[PDB]
Symmetry: C3
Subunit: 275 residues, 3 copies
């Protein structure tokens, strides 16, 4: 039944896995340093490996200068055997979470833990490794999604994605935090492979701070950005300004409607177009 | 302090296993606890009756020669509550989805829910589309499920982002061809909802679309806004910013700019005459 | 090759426990390590002094008859760094929130932060709204916290998405009534920020909104763009795409299309006369 370590003194009760490389050498990159897993009963035997598991793995070869280590969680899909178990959750050594559900990556790529390592594993991929260390990556066939299920209860269904801007840093000892600075952006858009590589977003919606903030003044804009056919340059086209003006983002450049996409009727207090 | 451990000196792996069976040597069952690791804290003169924080390995379907299904959950106990009210907040499904279900999101009865399919079975009125299973992250929260992206500037700029990354090909097979973004690529940010019978497709959205195929010197895009009319169930493109930067209605001679009691104050255009 | 394990042949669960106490048989404390599992790699002639990758169970509040609070963190060590600089990158809070805090996001001192409330206590100048605790995912990163949605086409189409899912009712109680999307349903995608005193509500946003209540034959929506003016702290609806697809200002006789040095090039409309 139950089983356990007890520390009565007030210290910690910790379980360790100790591993070495071949012939007392340093433990290696992507070596399984430790594991915990369930093995289910088939009727007369257990499965040959874990069907669900926690794995601790080496990140780079160990040395006096590298103690690199990362984590994955493995699951087995219903109707599949342990041959087809999936390392669906990967907490990278950089601190990124990769979520890779069933059907997203082949077995061969089970040790992929970053853009850098994905690039090495799939030479044609060429994603920007500058994105490593930024947060969550989801890889799924065709349609990777985030679903935000929001039952009303007695309030209102109000799911949200919220950027939170600030000046300063939480990384140092001082930890100064201050007012949103000018140049603050929140981009929601799409990058893609161009046949050679992934790069910057090429179409987007962005919330931007309209200058610096203070307690009585927090100005924003919402900007829509696209890229033209024959071009690789994402540009601001139309925006809602801080004062609420819907405006083109350059003077005398962008049209409202076209020949075969004409506005039905325009409603404006002033009947004359200001030129 | 009271450390404890397995050691493999040879170079092999040091792994801890949990072995479980069904009743009377039968196959282990669906949602059966196959293994667990958990802390039990000291109350003064006893420990808690169960773990207050735990990792659980669970069966997905009854085990057979054809099914070795298994999934994971992580359990926490909220401050000011007892283990009676512990929360399986993190659920890594057998399909590979992560479900995040914070305190107050789901009743105890739904602690074994690991998919839309299983949620549909547990709550018959729910009827979400199970086609969404296997797609990634699901967050269930009372009223306001959120993602917060906290972005301290440092010496650069506060630049939080949500980034779709389009490509041709597949990472799933042995060949693993990857290529240029294809026409018909989309990134939808919108809302589905229950219509009193079921959840379905998004009914209002902003979308980034590829404007055809991409190549090294040409990566065209559009931003489209889509809504659904009263008395209708059909989400339609209404207004978009085209690749060349034109703000346009998405159909000819259909949509107005402004209305009788929502009039633009003044229109600024270089050409003072409306092109009909 | 090595292995090690518990076996329950009877059909019961094989569970591993960690038992911990406070000092002198007292209650176990807030943020006390209640249990841990960790790898310790070989340096050539010794192991590392602590785990380089680990699962930790931790107290949330001091334990009592009324509090059994516990939470979870996962720790990793970045390549090219020693265990001195290991990162508690994954934090599943006692409230059930997931915090994702990659390398370089937070100092060592903040390793035990598990909520906005605790972050606020640790960094007094921070002042984020604790009303956001319990809502789901938080990502903290230097400058650019991101979510990447990598979408290989295969034989279909690259269609990454962020999907709100509105419903009436609750999954939290025993009844678990679920029903039609209600009026006042919203999906906000926008930015809050520090104003020099605190974080507060979003100050610029895009929102998908239900245009009233839904039924099986009627699921109306709008897309609204909201900004805040210089010298003001009030986020206001400015322009929206209505359910019938009208692009409209959100107040009558208030907002302009274009300005003096930001003029529309040419306006295309079927009717050449502006309806006043």
């Amino acid at each position: 039944c139950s089983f356990g370590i007890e520390n009565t003194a007030g210290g910690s009760a910790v379980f360790h896995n100790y591993t070495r490389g071949a012939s007392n050498s340093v433990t290696k990159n992507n070596q399984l340093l430790g594991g915990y897993g369930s093995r289910p009963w088939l009727g007369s035997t257990y499965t040959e490996h874990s069907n669900a598991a926690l794995h601790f793995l080496g990140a780079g070869d160990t040395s006096a200068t590298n103690h690199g280590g990362w984590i994955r969680l493995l699951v087995t899909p219903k109707g599949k055997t342990i041959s087809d178990r999936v390392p669906a959750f990967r907490l990278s050594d950089n601190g990124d979470l990769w979520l890779v559900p069933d059907g997203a990556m082949h077995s061969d790529l089970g040790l992929v833990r970053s853009i850098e390592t994905l690039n090495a594993a799939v030479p044609r991929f060429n994603a920007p490794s500058i994105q490593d260390g930024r947060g969550l990556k989801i890889v799924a066939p065709q349609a990777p999604e985030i679903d935000l299920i929001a039952p009303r209860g007695s309030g209102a269904s109000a799911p949200a994605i919220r950027a939170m801007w600030c000046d300063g840093s939480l990384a140092d000892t001082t930890r100064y935090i201050g007012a949103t600075q000018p140049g603050s952006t929140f981009y929601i858009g799409a990058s893609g492979h161009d046949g050679e590589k992934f790069d910057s977003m090429r179409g987007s919606v962005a919330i931007k701070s309209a200058g610096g903030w203070g307690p009585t003044s927090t100005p924003t804009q919402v900007v829509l950005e696209t890229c033209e056919s024959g071009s690789i340059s994402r540009l601001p086209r139309w925006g809602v300004d801080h004062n609420g003006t819907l405006m083109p983002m350059a003077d005398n450049r962008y049209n409202l409607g076209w020949g075969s996409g004409r506005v039905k009727q325009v409603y404006a207090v002033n009947g004359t177009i200001n030129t």
